[PDB]
């Protein structure tokens, strides 16, 4: 679980752009305001390699 | 963090800074001047100094003095 990728972002990267920001992403009407829920998600996720 | 490091009126001193594809690029020039009321008309082209692989977004800046 040490390896991660970004599953959510505001907009696509420019060439060689790098981004460490961890803030909760909003995908719809729900005001997420720092917590997960329906259309509210933590942006970094793991492959869980087995 | 702390991911990169490098070490290298009488005058008008002139600089240019620009960022392209996550590279960051600098140019400059230095000259004597006759008068200080406004920028003096004429030519003295600026020349490159450094080109840094920063991989960072820049939208604001400030002078340190
Ligand atoms: C840099 O990040 C800011 C804040 O997210 C954003 O407004 C800006 O559009 C980004 N820079 C460029 C060149 O798009």
| Residue carrying structure tokens 């040490």 | A2
- Elucidation method: cryo-EM
Dihedral-angle region of residue A27 (phi above 0 means left; psi in -120 to 50 means alpha; beta otherwise): alpha
Beta bridge mates, A22? none
* Among candidate residues A17, B48, B34, B27, the one with its CA nearest the CA of residue B12: B34
Does B5 contact chain A (CB < 8 Å)? Answer: no
A38 in Cβ contact with A30 (< 8 Å)? yes
Q: Tell me how long chain A is.
A: 50
Q: Which of residues 10-29 of B touch A (CB under 8 A)?
A: 21-22
Compute the distance between CA of residue B35 and CA of residue B44 in angstroms, rounded to an integer.
16
Q: Which atom from ligand 1 is nearest to the alpha carbon of A10?
A: 5
- The DSSP H or E segment spanning B29 is strand B23-32
Compute the distance between CA of residue A44 and CA of residue A22 in angstroms, rounded to an integer.
7
Residue B36, classed as helix, strand or coil, is: coil
Q: Which tokens go with B7?
A: 């070490």
Q: Which tokens go with B51?
A: 């080109």
């Amino acid at each position: 679980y040490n390896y991660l990728y970004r599953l959510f972002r505001k907009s696509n990267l420019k060439p060689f752009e790098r981004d460490i920001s961890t803030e909760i992403y909003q995908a719809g009407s729900t005001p997420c305001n720092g917590v997960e829920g329906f259309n509210c998600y933590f942006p970094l996720q793991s492959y869980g390699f087995q | 963090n702390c991911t990169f490091e490098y070490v290298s009126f009488k005058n008008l001193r002139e600089f240019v800074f620009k960022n392209i594809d996550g590279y960051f690029k600098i140019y400059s020039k230095h000259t004597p001047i006759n008068l200080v009321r406004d920028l003096p008309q004429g030519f003295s082209a600026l020349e490159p100094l450094v080109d840094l692989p920063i991989g960072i977004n820049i939208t604001r800046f400030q002078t340190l003095l």
